[PDB]
Design a protein around this ligand. Structure first.
Ligand SMILES: *[C@@H]1O[C@H](CO)[C@@H](O)[C@H](O)[C@H]1NC(C)=O
Ligand code: NA
Lengths: 44, 251, 25
């Protein structure tokens, strides 16, 4: 879970530890149709 | 969103719709950042030139949506607001400096395949990724063109961050360090922008360091939409993170 | 110094005409 939480779950609530990982994509290692375009913008 | 395409199902599970009960209206976009906090643009809640000044009781949020207009039963979740917090130095009189607001849900929302929070960047992620020519992604149910053209489902477009001197020189509006702009230059051979109805929606980036999505920006303002030599302006989330922290820690 | 052309990005409608589908109760 390559992520260090910033906020206090007591006041922030739950969900930060697993933030930014989509159940239908990252969690299954499936890619969306245009995310490659984002990753490529780092190279170019 | 102009020159975008239909989102895939679950592609932006942090996407939130701010909705007016009566008369029923989509107001703005927003983003889910935990089970109980939603981030949006300040001007979606408070804009006196348009006689806009909503209280908590004034609005609903709709989470996990795809269709703009359908009631997606057993998929979307609808929540009431407990309190709205607007940045105290939000500049509605001039340039929308610090266009940011937080909304606390009355009850925590359950996560699903369609509902899942986005990360806010840490200092290092923000410094690494917020660079000219890298692309982020903007989503929303706003207008398809400068003008009523409205999508049937959530739209997505990916757009490159623009160097600050080009952002500045593109507009007569005074820009600030609490803003960044994104979009293709004239002659870059691609188009795309956010538009009216997209404010408050997230400008997100996928980290190459940990495969997580981070919300770098909030759709704020522009001059028209998708015009040559103009760029969309976004609230700089990390720059205002001390405020977010202060609010969440006090409620 | 001129914000004359500043267009905040929210404005609204029910585009089919008169309709979102009802929710909640
Ligand atoms: C918005 O409304 C509240 C009271 O409902 C008020 O305290 C505040 O001054 C208003 N904002 C203005 C007038 O800019
Ligand atoms: Na443009």
């Amino acid at each position: 879970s390559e992520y260090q939480t910033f906020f206090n779950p007591r006041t922030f609530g739950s969900g930060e530890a697993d933030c930014g990982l989509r159940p239908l994509f990252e969690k299954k290692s499936l890619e969306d149709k245009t995310e490659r375009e984002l990753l490529e913008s780092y190279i170019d | 969103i102009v020159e975008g395409s239909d989102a895939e199902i679950g592609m932006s599970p942090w996407q939130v719709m701010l909705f007016r009960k009566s008369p029923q209206e989509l107001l703005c976009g927003a983003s889910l950042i935990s089970d109980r906090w939603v981030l949006t643009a300040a001007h979606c809640l408070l804009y006196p030139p348009w006689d806009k000044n909503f209280t908590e009781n004034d609005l609903l949020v709709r989470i996990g949506k795809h269709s703009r207009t359908r009631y997606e039963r057993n998929i979307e979740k609808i929540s009431m607001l407990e309190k709205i917090y607007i940045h105290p130095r939000y500049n509605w009189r001039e340039n929308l400096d610090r266009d940011i607001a937080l909304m606390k849900l009355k009850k925590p929302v359950a996560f699903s395949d369609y509902i899942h929070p986005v990360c806010l960047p840490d200092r290092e992620t923000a410094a690494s990724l917020l660079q000219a020519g890298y692309k982020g992604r903007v989503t929303g149910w706003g207008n398809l063109k400068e003008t009523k053209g409205q999508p049937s489902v959530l739209q997505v477009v990916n757009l490159p961050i623009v160097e600050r001197p080009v952002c500045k020189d593109s507009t007569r509006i005074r820009i600030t360090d609490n803003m960044f702009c994104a979009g293709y230059k004239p002659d870059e051979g691609k188009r795309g922008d956010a538009c009216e109805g997209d404010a408050g929606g997230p400008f997100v980036m996928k980290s190459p360091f940990n495969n997580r999505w981070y919300q770098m920006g909030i759709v704020s303002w522009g001059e028209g939409c998708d015009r040559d030599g103009k760029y969309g302006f976004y609230t700089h989330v990390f720059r205002l993170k001390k405020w977010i922290q202060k609010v969440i820690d006090q409620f | 110094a001129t914000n004359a052309t500043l267009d905040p990005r929210s404005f609204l409608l029910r585009n089919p005409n008169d309709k979102y589908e009802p929710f909640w109760e």
